[PDB]
Structure formats: structure tokens, C-alpha cells
Design a protein around this ligand. Structure first.
Ligand SMILES: *[C@@H]1O[C@H](CO)[C@@H](O[C@@H]2O[C@H](CO)[C@@H](O)[C@H](O)[C@H]2NC(C)=O)[C@H](O)[C@H]1NC(C)=O
Ligand SMILES: *[C@@H]1O[C@H](CO)[C@@H](O[C@@H]2O[C@H](CO)[C@@H](O)[C@H](O)[C@H]2NC(C)=O)[C@H](O)[C@H]1NC(C)=O
Ligand SMILES: *[C@@H]1O[C@H](CO)[C@@H](O[C@@H]2O[C@H](CO)[C@@H](O)[C@H](O)[C@H]2NC(C)=O)[C@H](O)[C@H]1NC(C)=O
Ligand SMILES: *[C@@H]1O[C@H](CO)[C@@H](O[C@@H]2O[C@H](CO)[C@@H](O)[C@H](O)[C@H]2NC(C)=O)[C@H](O)[C@H]1NC(C)=O
Ligand SMILES: *[C@@H]1O[C@H](CO)[C@@H](O)[C@H](O)[C@H]1NC(C)=O
Ligand SMILES: *[C@@H]1O[C@H](CO)[C@@H](O)[C@H](O)[C@H]1NC(C)=O
Ligand SMILES: *[C@@H]1O[C@H](CO)[C@@H](O)[C@H](O)[C@H]1NC(C)=O
Ligand SMILES: *[C@@H]1O[C@H](CO)[C@@H](O)[C@H](O)[C@H]1NC(C)=O
Ligand SMILES: *[C@@H]1O[C@H](CO)[C@@H](O)[C@H](O)[C@H]1NC(C)=O
Ligand SMILES: *[C@@H]1O[C@H](CO)[C@@H](O)[C@H](O)[C@H]1NC(C)=O
Lengths: 134, 418, 97, 49, 49
């Protein structure tokens, strides 16, 4: 009853008591992270993919995102057209079920490459050809 | 010690030891502006006047993060093809069930790999993350590293050291162990005549490995130290945000909501100086630890190449005793080598001579050593007592008996005479 | 003067006597059992026969050692004697420490 | 008011100090038992005095 | 400020030198294992010749 707000191990305010309703509200910082651009060389193509690192695809939305509102950024800032990898939300790359040698490392076993539609593809990297010794 | 006494082992022991090596550490990324200033534009503009420290820190952290994946790739991705063990597990009586993959569990790790995985406990994460610090997942998942170790094990136990030099050439495991025995100076007939005993000793040592790992708390010490060091560094970096550094408050929003810009600049700059110093200290410590981890990973890669993909003559490089073989196992942020070595066990002392005098000729052993049990003289291999009659095939002649010091008169049998 | 301002020097865990004992043990093991003491129990062997094994290890038959034992011992003793002058003369020999 | 710099420096110095003893132990304590030379110094004519 | 900066510089230099000394000590331990406790086929690892 005498306590007002709570702190974590790092001493950052993570809970607070409402002055009027006298209820305990948990506080979670709004989502953030790094943005990575996955691209073949400009000698090859100008197509890119965007990886929002460590965030669920549902959170990625242009309206509140730090991404700009320029048409291309609007295309690359919609989580609806986004594949969810353990490394984050990937937009602009199509996930295939084949396995190739890693070309552009995304993370958590996911790699990306450029293949002739000629979009960026994302796949699970192949460790090598399976072999059984006689 | 005397000038005519030698000690030769009459038995042996198969000993399996464990060596644990860190390979990679946690890949971390830090947002310079978010950490120093949070979401305040005034602080961001003030920090913009400090030059390009943020880009330097970002580049250093990115280099460390890429180097971690490079370390893992170099240590584990040393196999060209993913070999698979045959469904039939008849390897001369040797039992690798405790180190082979277990398909029942989803992770497909072995029994010992699961023990290692459970033995290392991680160090809470959200609070560290909330201030511009992120943890990048490793490029290779634990499943992929387990697959790499399984491929290495299958190649080793189905093709010996041949798969490390080219195509995997199958060979029965008993004959592979005979080759390994030849590699340490013991004739292969010893292996073929003590196969059951050697298999039993190997199985017993593999069984003891489990208790050896479980009992000693400091066995998995290096990996735990790496994890603890990373967690402690991140905790200190986050705790540094609570310092005032001579300002009136450690919260930037309070400074913004309590002071006008001309007076807020002083406090914001005081905070910026301390936070930038703490960030730079963290980056320098990370660079030093990354260099240490890279050295450890290079050592681990060398051990993978020379102990697992081959048989090493280097003393104590692949365990105590004469190296026979080695088996890799994955572990959190590291690798574990099970070194199987040969140890002489029960030595007896015999009389010895450097040469044998016969018909005015000096005979020297071709591949062994002359021994005497008190009355008769034999020639035996050096690492295992197996006496044999001294003939003209066990020895070679060089000069007369007037030069060698300690030469002993004896008769040398001749196979052609009868 | 360095110590007076909060700086201290912690003595090493192993004294120089203990390190000398370790080196003496290593020397005794090497010269009484060859390389056997590093792989398990120390198996005694006459030093001439140990040197014959060493010669076999470098591609020279042991009869060479047994027929030039006196010359080899003389050369080894001469080199050990020269080590003293080699250390004493050059000032940069003990440079790293 | 400067935070926990002192603890960091103390931990770093302690780690270095322990690592020095570890280095000496690894270099020299590679022998299981303290072997002793025999009183008689007849080693094929070699002189280790 | 100045004294803390000097202390931090000293600690960083000590860490770098400790890493170098650890590398040297690992090399010395390897040489003890492979040159003293055995005979090495590695060229120039245990001397010329
Ligand atoms: C070599 O040593 C092994 C032990 O490592 C001996 O095998 C044991 O022999 C005793 C009888 O003396 C049995 O009671 C044990 O059950 C055996 N153990 C195993 C694992 O087989 C072996 O007899 C020894 N050989 C020689 C020639 O001494
Ligand atoms: C290889 O060793 C394992 C033990 O590590 C053996 O599995 C055990 O077998 C006994 C007898 O069948 C059972 O009582 C245990 O419960 C088993 N333990 C486990 C973990 O499975 C296995 O049988 C051995 N393989 C061979 C061919 O003998
Ligand atoms: C040294 O070894 C020789 C050869 O094995 C032993 O001579 C044998 O002794 C047994 C007695 O148990 C006889 O049955 C054999 O006929 C002997 N062989 C020959 C070729 O004469 C000798 O006894 C051993 N000396 C010891 C153990 O002191
Ligand atoms: C081993 O070498 C030492 C020298 O390093 C010999 O000791 C010398 O012996 C000569 C002749 O007796 C003396 O004049 C010297 O004063 C001795 N020097 C020292 C430092 O003791 C020793 O005699 C040699 N051992 C053998 C067995 O010849
Ligand atoms: C404040 O007034 C509102 C209005 O009804 C009431 O619901 C609430 O319980 C009051 N809280 C306190 C702390 O007085
Ligand atoms: C993202 O949010 C959805 C909806 O809550 C959830 O089903 C999904 O598991 C989340 N993503 C991850 C990686 O957990
Ligand atoms: C991959 O396989 C899954 C089934 O696990 C299927 O739902 C999906 O459509 C497949 N995608 C492609 C590109 O083959
Ligand atoms: C082994 O050493 C003992 C101890 O002195 C000795 O009595 C015995 O004769 C030695 N054995 C041989 C074969 O010389
Ligand atoms: C071994 O040493 C003893 C003691 O001096 C000696 O009598 C004997 O001749 C030596 N043996 C040889 C082969 O030199
Ligand atoms: C060895 O044999 C030769 C020739 O028969 C003889 O001259 C010599 O004295 C013998 N040595 C011993 C120690 O019996």
C-alpha cells in the first residue's frame, strides 16, 4: 500500500501505481531496433530487402514507424508483406523451401540471395551434400 | 635408473579425456544515439558536435559480430559433405551410443551434448535491451552445429582420417584402430588380439565421461566465464545510465521538462560526456575479449583439424598419453573434444643391452629393443612387452664388437640354417 | 615511492624455489625416462639407448650413435659449456624478460 | 558520482593477476610427480652438471 | 577527471600486455609439452636442425 512505482534490476521504472484508480500498470518500452538493407551489388540490380531486427512483423507499420512515407519506404514499411524470421521481420524477399549455399547471411540459419520474376529470395542455408558411407 | 636396466609395459589403458574450448561470444549491437540520448532531439544535436565516435563504435561492434560467425564457421564447417552413420552399429564392439545423435529429441543432440547444453546456464534480458542494446542471433543455429558435429563423427568412425584429406574411404573400425595403434608404435597384432579388452576399456571410459562432466562444477568453466563476462559487461553498461556525472539528474526527460535550453545544455553535455566514455570503455573491453575468443577459436579449429581429422604426434596436444583419436561435441558458445589416448599400464623391469655380439659381429634391433629376463635374451617392441627370439630378421649387423659400449655376448638364430 | 599511492604488488603463487623444483623434476624425468614420463609412468632407460631412440627419430640408424657415443658426448658437453659464454656475452640475449 | 568505474578496474586487475599464476602453472606444472636424479651420474658419458 | 583517465589508460595497457604475455605463455607451454616431454618433427619449433 505504501509503494508507488517499481524498478527492475537496472533500476528503470517498470511499474507504476495510478494516482486515481490505484491500480498497478506495467510499463514496456515501445519497440525499436536496427534496420538492415539486403542487396545484391548495384552492378546486378537495384532491388533490396529490408530486415527489421528483433521485432515481430505485426509491429512493423508505416504509420508509426521511423521509416519515411516516401512511396518506396511505404512499400518497405508494411508488415503485412513480411516474413517472420528469428532475426526479425523481412520485407521484400520471398521464402523458398529449397536449400542453397549461404550467399547473404541474415541470421538464425536464414540466408538471402538474388535469383533470376527476379526477386530477392530467403532460404535456410544448406550445410552440404548429404552422404552415406558404404 | 641404471645403465643396463629398462622398463617396458606389459599392459595398457584406453583413456578418454575432455577438453573444452570457447569458440564464439554473444554478438551485441549498440545504438549510439539511443543509448546516449534516448529520444531527445536536443541531446542528439549536442552529441552531433562530438564528431564520428558513434560510427567508430558501430564499426567495431559489427566487426566483432561478423568475427563470431567466422570463428564458428572455421571451427565447425571443416567437413565437405554431411556424412551419416550407417543404420547398423557394429563397430568391432565399440559403442558410440552416448556420442551419436539421438533422433528422439527434436534438437537431435547426443547424450553428452545434451548434458553440456543443460550444464551451462544463461544469465533480465529485456532490461538490458531497453536502452538501445540488441543481441544478434548467430548465423548457425544449434541444430546446424549439431549436424556438423554428427557429420564429423560419422566421417571419423566410418572412414578414419581419409575423409579429411579427400573422399571418405570406408574401412572397418577394428582395422582403423589397428592403423591408429601402428601410428603410436604398437604393432596391430596387439589390437587384433586384445580387441575385446580395448572395446571394453573404451566403453568404460565413455561411460565415465558422463560422471566426470556432471560431478565437477568447474569443468564447464570457460564457457560459463564467457557468458558471465558478457552479461556483466552489459549490466555495467546499463547501470552507467543511472549515474549523474555531475549533472543535476540522470534522467534526460527531467532535464528537458525542468530547464530551458540555455541551462539544459550544460547538464545534457555533462551526461553525454559520461555516457560516451562508458560506451567507449565497453567497446574497448569487447574488442579485447573478442581477440581472446578469436585466439581460442583458432586453437579449437587447429585441434579439430589435427586431432579429429587425423592422428597427432604432437605431445599433449590431443590429451595425455599417445593420441589415438578424438570426437567433437558441440556446446553453448564452444566445443568439447573427447580425446581417446593410449597409456602404458603395467611395466616390468628387464636387463637391457645396446647390441648383441655374435661371431665377431654386432647386431642391433631393427625396430625394438634387446631385453633379458635374467637368463635368456629376446627382442621386443618398445611400447609393449612381446618377447621374440633374436634372429637375423629382427636385427641388422654393423661392424664388430670392439666399439659399442655395453655389448653383450649372445647367439643370434638363423632361420635359413635348419 | 610507487607503492605509497595505493599501488601494491602481489607476490606470485609459486615461489622461485617451487619453479626450480618443477624444472628439476622435468630434467630428472627427461634424463632418466626419455619421453615416457610425459605419457604416463616414468619407464627408466639407459641414456645411451635413449639417444639411440632419438637418432632413430630423425632418420639416423642407432648404430651411428653407438659407434660415435664418445664423440657425441664430447660435442654435447662442449655445447653445454659454450652456453654459459653465450648467455654472459650478449647483452640482448635476456632481452624479452 | 562517477558510477562503477572503480569496480571495473579492480575486476580487470584481479583477472590479470589470476591469469599470471595460471600462466606459470600451465608452463611449469606439467609433471605429475617430483622426479629426482639418481645419486650416480653415469649417463653414457654425457655431463649435465 | 584526469586521475581517473590515467587509471583507465593504465588498466587498458595492462590488459593488452597481459594478452601478449598470455600468448607467449601458451607458446612456452606448447614448447614444454612438445620439445621437452617428447621429440618434435616440427621444423624450427625446437631449434635449428
Ligand atoms: C590388462 O589389464 C586389464 C585391466 O585393464 C586386465 O583385465 C582385467 O583382468 C582381471 C583379472 O586379472 C579381471 O578381473 C577384470 O575383469 C579384467 N578387466 C577387464 C576390463 O577386462 C587384463 O587381464 C590385463 N592383462 C594382462 C595380460 O595383464
Ligand atoms: C551402448 O551403451 C549404452 C549405454 O550408454 C547401452 O544402453 C543401455 O543398455 C542397457 C542394457 O540393454 C540398458 O539397461 C540401459 O538402460 C541402456 N541405456 C541407455 C542410455 O540406452 C547400449 O545397449 C550399448 N550398446 C550395445 C550395442 O551394447
Ligand atoms: C626367462 O625366459 C625363458 C624363456 O621363456 C625361460 O626359460 C623357460 O623356462 C621354463 C620354465 O618355466 C621352461 O619350461 C622352458 O623350457 C624354458 N625355455 C627355454 C627356451 O629354455 C626362463 O625360465 C626365464 N627366466 C626367468 C623367468 O627367470
Ligand atoms: C662436468 O662438467 C663440469 C664443468 O662444467 C666438471 O667440473 C669441472 O671439473 C674440472 C676437473 O675436475 C675442474 O677443474 C673444474 O673446476 C670443475 N668445474 C665445476 C664448475 O665444477 C665436471 O667434472 C664434469 N663431470 C664429469 C663427470 O666429468
Ligand atoms: C477521483 O474521483 C473519481 C470521480 O468519481 C473517482 O471515481 C475516483 O475514485 C477518485 N479517486 C480518488 C483517489 O479520490
Ligand atoms: C508475433 O505476434 C503474433 C500475434 O500475437 C504471434 O502469434 C507470434 O508468435 C509473434 N511472433 C513471434 C516470433 O513470437
Ligand atoms: C514450403 O512448404 C510448406 C509446408 O511446410 C508450404 O506451406 C509452403 O507453401 C512451401 N513454400 C514453398 C515456396 O515451397
Ligand atoms: C627389477 O628391480 C628389482 C629391484 O632391485 C631387482 O631385484 C630385479 O632384479 C630387477 N629385474 C631385473 C630383470 O633385473
Ligand atoms: C654401469 O655402471 C657401473 C658402475 O660404475 C659399471 O661398473 C658398469 O661397467 C657400467 N656399465 C656399462 C655398460 O658401462
Ligand atoms: C664375449 O665373447 C668373446 C669371444 O668369444 C670373448 O673374447 C669375450 O671375453 C666375451 N665377453 C664376455 C663378457 O664374456
Amino acid at each position: 500500500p505504501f509503494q508507488q512505482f517499481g524498478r527492475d534490476i537496472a533500476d528503470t521504472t517498470d511499474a507504476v501505481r495510478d494516482p486515481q484508480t490505484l491500480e498497478i500498470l506495467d510499463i514496456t518500452p515501445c519497440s525499436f531496433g536496427g534496420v538492415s538493407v539486403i542487396t545484391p551489388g548495384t552492378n546486378t540490380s537495384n532491388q533490396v530487402a529490408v530486415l527489421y531486427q528483433g521485432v515481430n512483423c505485426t509491429e512493423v507499420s508505416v504509420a508509426i514507424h521511423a521509416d519515411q512515407l516516401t512511396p518506396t519506404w511505404r512499400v518497405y514499411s508494411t508488415g503485412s508483406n513480411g516474413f517472420q524470421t528469428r532475426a526479425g521481420c523481412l520485407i521484400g524477399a520471398e521464402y523458398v523451401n529449397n536449400s542453397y549455399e549461404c550467399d547473404i547471411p541474415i541470421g538464425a540459419g536464414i540466408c538471402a540471395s538474388y535469383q533470376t520474376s527476379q526477386p530477392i529470395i530467403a532460404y535456410t542455408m544448406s550445410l552440404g551434400a548429404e552422404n552415406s558411407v558404404a | 635408473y641404471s645403465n643396463n636396466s629398462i622398463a617396458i609395459p606389459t599392459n595398457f589403458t584406453i583413456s578418454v579425456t575432455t577438453e573444452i574450448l570457447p569458440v564464439s561470444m554473444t554478438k551485441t549491437s549498440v545504438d549510439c544515439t539511443m543509448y546516449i540520448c534516448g529520444d531527445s532531439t536536443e541531446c542528439s544535436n549536442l552529441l552531433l558536435q562530438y564528431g564520428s565516435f558513434c560510427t567508430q563504435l558501430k564499426r567495431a561492434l559489427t566487426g566483432i559480430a561478423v568475427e563470431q560467425d567466422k570463428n564458428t564457421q572455421e571451427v565447425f564447417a571443416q567437413v565437405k559433405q554431411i556424412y551419416k552413420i550407417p543404420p547398423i552399429k557394429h563397430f568391432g564392439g565399440f559403442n558410440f551410443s552416448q556420442i551419436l545423435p539421438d533422433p528422439s529429441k527434436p534438437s537431435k543432440r547426443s547424450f553428452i551434448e545434451d548434458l553440456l547444453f543443460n550444464k551451462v546456464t544463461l544469465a533480465l534480458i529485456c532490461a538490458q535491451k531497453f536502452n538501445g542494446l540488441t543481441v544478434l542471433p548467430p548465423l548457425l543455429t544449434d541444430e546446424m552445429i549439431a549436424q556438423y558435429t554428427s557429420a564429423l563423427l560419422a566421417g571419423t568412425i566410418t572412414s578414419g582420417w581419409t575423409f579429411g584429406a579427400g573422399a571418405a574411404l570406408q574401412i572397418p573400425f577394428a582395422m582403423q584402430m589397428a592403423y591408429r595403434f601402428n601410428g603410436i608404435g604398437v604393432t596391430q597384432n596387439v589390437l587384433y588380439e586384445n580387441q575385446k579388452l580395448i572395446a571394453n576399456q573404451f566403453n568404460s571410459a565413455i561411460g565415465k565421461i558422463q560422471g566426470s562432466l556432471s560431478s565437477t562444477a568447474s569443468a564447464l568453466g570457460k564457457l560459463q566465464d564467457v557468458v558471465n563476462h558478457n552479461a556483466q559487461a552489459l549490466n555495467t553498461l546499463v547501470k552507467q545510465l543511472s549515474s549523474k556525472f555531475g549533472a543535476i539528474s540522470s534522467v534526460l526527460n527531467d532535464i528537458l521538462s525542468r530547464l530551458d535550453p540555455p541551462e539544459a545544455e550544460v547538464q545534457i553535455d555533462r551526461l553525454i560526456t559520461g555516457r560516451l566514455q562508458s560506451l567507449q570503455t565497453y567497446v574497448t573491453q569487447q574488442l579485447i575479449r573478442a581477440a581472446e575468443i578469436r585466439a581460442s577459436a583458432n586453437l579449437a579449429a587447429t585441434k579439430m583439424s589435427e586431432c579429429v581429422l587425423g592422428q597427432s604426434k604432437r605431445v599433449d596436444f590431443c590429451g595425455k598419453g599417445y593420441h589415438l583419436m578424438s570426437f567433437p561435441q558441440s556446446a553453448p558458445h564452444g566445443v568439447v573434444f573427447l580425446h581417446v589416448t593410449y597409456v602404458p599400464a603395467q611395466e616390468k623391469n628387464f636387463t637391457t643391452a645396446p647390441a648383441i655380439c655374435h661371431d665377431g659381429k654386432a647386431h642391433f634391433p631393427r625396430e625394438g629393443v634387446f631385453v633379458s629376463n635374467g637368463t635368456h635374451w629376446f627382442v621386443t617392441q618398445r611400447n609393449f612387452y612381446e618377447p621374440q627370439i633374436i634372429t637375423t630378421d629382427n636385427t641388422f649387423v654393423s661392424g664388430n664388437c670392439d666399439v659399442v659400449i655395453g655389448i653383450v655376448n649372445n647367439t643370434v638364430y638363423d632361420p635359413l640354417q635348419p
